[PDB]
Amino acid sequence: AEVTQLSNGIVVATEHNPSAHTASVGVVFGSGAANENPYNNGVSNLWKNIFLSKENSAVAAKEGLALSSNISRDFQSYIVSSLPGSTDKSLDFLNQSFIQQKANLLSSSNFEATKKSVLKQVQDFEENDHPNRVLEHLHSTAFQNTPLSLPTRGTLESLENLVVADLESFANNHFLNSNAVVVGTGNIKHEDLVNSIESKNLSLQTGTKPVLKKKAAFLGSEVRLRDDTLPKAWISLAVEGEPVNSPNYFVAKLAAQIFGSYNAFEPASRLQGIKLLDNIQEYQLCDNFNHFSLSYKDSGLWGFSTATRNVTMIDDLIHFTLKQWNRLTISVTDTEVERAKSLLKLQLGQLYESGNPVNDANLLGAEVLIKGSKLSLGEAFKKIDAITVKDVKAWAGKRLWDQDIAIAGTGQIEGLLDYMRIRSDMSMMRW
Template sequence: MLGRRFASSSAAVKTQFSTLKNGLTVATESNPFAKTSSIGLYLEAGSRAENPYNSGVSSLTTKVLASPLRLKGIENGVYISTINSKEISGITTEFANGNNKAAVELLKQVLKSSQESFNNTSLVANEAKLAGKLAETIEATPRVTVLEHLNSTAFQGTPLALPTYGKADTVSTLESMDLEAFYKKNFVASNIAIVGTGDINHDELVSLAENLELSSGTKPESKNSSFLGSEVRFRDDTLPKAYIAIAAQGESLDSPNYWVAKIASEVNGEYNAHSIFSNFLGSKLSHIIRENHLADTYSHFSTSYTDNGLWGFYTETDNVGNIDDLIHFTLKDWNRLSTSITAGEIERAKSALKLKVLSVSESPLLQANKLAGDVLLSGFKPSSEEVVSRINAITVSDVMKWAQTALWDKDIAISGTGQIEGLYDYNRLRNDMAALRW
């Protein structure tokens, strides 16, 4: 073991990171009060590590590796599953406390029998078929479709534009050779983290992880992404609503303005017309939306990747005759971030953000997924105290300065489906990114 990179602790939860001689990272978030535990093998290779010809291979590879061991895992009290995102994929386990060795042994068997799994053509074909159906299901979900297309048009021409779970007509045709090539390139120790959460002893997991059979190859490099102002529309009047997302270029994970952008997104936050709390939201935009029934829901976001990001909002509305008003008032409110945002609004946004980022999930598996993203993409996890300190230090001036640089008169990416006839042309919407009046 080379050494500890970072450790933080609170009254119950203790977070530790270690790097082994072969480059493998071991991260734990120990909580002796957790009812269950999770250990996962995560790699920094999600859909971004793919290309248009093998789209979906990251998700399919982990599924093929995990599938043959599901029954054995259940027999040993361990539930095995997989996850996939733009920049991370993984094979995860959940189990009752005290079954750590069985979980790691299961992950060890996943690696040891990888070639056998790839050689099982019927297994690969069946999982590819299921993956194709999953992709079709995702593509039929308006919210997911719109946000995937937003990424696709914003980062077009780069791997970051590829769909998270692949395209249905591509993933269903993948074969063993595609999976083997992905495995050989990405399943290397320096590209992997073993993450444990729940009632986990860090040193014990380090000892178990040292016995995993992993290649010591070079960590793959990912192609840089670039933002492009553009739009993609799939009008479908058979859908009951209009589903729309608009975003400007956001901040990367290592950006000094990462938390500033997060706070800016919380100024207007989220709105749901059907929520009993909708009348009590404090943002100016939510009042305009509610009083004029311009949208059923909206949510602002600041999504960050390793080298880029998106800052914007997603909305659904059945008032399809007033889409122009909905978008106009939203983008005008974005203008306020550059000119007239108040200290009270920023303080409310900071409180909302702290509530979100400091909330502890009841599921050790969800905690493990989050911790894996921290260690693989950022190399560390800030303590709660550090997060609070960074958020508290941000001022109205910081937000205004950021908005003047990142939002004011900047290009945008637009994605929409459903009854979007009333979604005006790109130039009309782009012009609303800057105005001389409110």
């Protein structure tokens, strides 16, 4: 239902949803922020703000288009959403302003203005966005000195040393033909998109992207950026999860869905079916937490990110949630895995099917760039409902029993103890 056809150059992937209005045509590349050096890092976010600049967005919005882009840890995307009658116009704009000549984008005007803007918004992200920066610090301390350790926004010390030669070399090195998928979602049919792709000669380059030497290997480490002037104590810890296109991928997402999310202030979230909420609600040990399960091209994380105003009982929160983690290996029952199966089906149907045709385009581009053909939602629900409790017990024995964890924190985390107690907490003496 979400078809994919490979031409002589590019590969096109679309899903015709004839109920939505705004059709959306873009191109998604398969080399995000884990395909560059630590010395030119931050050139992908800079490319995103080149494409979303004022002049390019004005000469896009005069036509009736709306630009959107997304930089992740393995794919970067460039989406031109538009009206359903206006799709060859959007494809011709994406041809004339990204695939061919980019000299009107890479001026001494546009590049300096957008570099000042990127430096400002990146230092604001470093100063006043605390859970996302400790998630990025967890990524920088888990896969350290291997190229999954780069921040996807870049950092200011590796961003004030960039000129247009590095951006042009990154364009020649990663905006290739064997690196891109042209996505389509909204109410375009497949033959309309591929005929408008076949009419105008739309191909970027010929070669292949450079393979890179280091594999993303997990290293159990610890970092703490303690700021004792902050009100809370954000701290995230995670183990090595499954990568994408691994057979234990849905089991990892299901085990993350077992402990789910929590927010202490909504009254409908203090009543969930999690066993942890009967431990962390007598002294208000945390204000919110959520168990992510990220899966990149080479490796991935699996763990929870919390935030705490009770800055003295941090160790009790870590202790209770790691005992609940060991409960997956020893004594997870069947009613929690059925609850997590239903909630994971709800969450994947919410994520894969929204009214937004840019999240659908980015998901289709990522999972077509990795696998080659995006799997369905009925077959994904079958793969969810074919999971036992011995399967998640075997996965928890493989990846959660006495493994090495990576910890990142900020705020007032002196109440957090040292590393070896938290690492000795990942496996208990059977009670």
